[PDB]
Design a protein around this ligand. Structure first.
Ligand SMILES: [Cl-]
Ligand SMILES: [Cl-]
Ligand SMILES: [Zn+2]
Ligand SMILES: [Zn+2]
Lengths: 21, 30, 30, 21, 30, 21, 30, 21, 30, 21, 30, 21
């Protein structure tokens, strides 16, 4: 999920957009 | 732009930045 | 608890603290 | 909605809790 | 509501959220 | 104190109210 | 240092950074 | 007080330091 | 991404997230 | 400049990126 | 005032606090 | 740099002023 993608690993601002509605 | 660690309140802050008016979901359990 | 006056990113911080491991959905108008 | 209400008037943590998953 | 780790500026932010107008004290030395 | 209760350990929003004036 | 314009939670952040390990008391009107 | 002064006009870090324990 | 309405410290947070390891310069008027 | 523009109107992340080193 | 650890967004927040209108640079690579 | 002085080590608000323009 988001925490594994973005906190545990690293993510781009683009990947963060995956979680917009 | 870049790739960094975003955790906790800081992750939800970045979600707000990128999504804004579209809204978003934060589901760590997912 | 006290009533809250929360704009912008301060609303998302508040939802983060209130919801914790459950997460939340952020859904503004338009 | 809740995003406008908390900004233009006030809102409670109890009203906030309804937007939890 | 939930139980999470709240440290540093984030702990004082949560104190502000919950106490508001009542005011509060942050005394780590305590 | 607050740091041991809430940072080192975990605390609820209710426990955080212990430190309101 | 420069003079400061600080509302809401930004005041508590500033007191946190200024006071450090001493902590602080946050005491609004009414 | 300090909470109103910093919000409605300005305030210094030196004025802030007086609210330290 | 969405357009942004950012005052004060929220602008510096946004530059931080956008610039990452590159850093940034913060240059207000006067 | 960018600090006034983001506060008094709006600004994009793409406009922000120009202030990166 | 005190000496504490200031990292990430929190370091840039403190730079904003202390520098304000003078502006500042955040260059971790430096 | 700033990260070594202020995050890895500890710095004062005065040292932070080193990075003002
Ligand atoms: Cl942190
Ligand atoms: Cl604000
Ligand atoms: Zn943090
Ligand atoms: Zn704010």
């Amino acid at each position: 999920g988001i925490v594994e993608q973005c906190c545990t690993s690293i993510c781009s601002l683009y990947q963060l957009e995956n979680y917009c509605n | 732009f870049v790739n960094q660690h975003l955790c906790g309140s800081h992750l939800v802050e970045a979600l707000y930045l990128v999504c804004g008016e579209r809204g978003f979901f934060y589901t760590p359990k997912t």
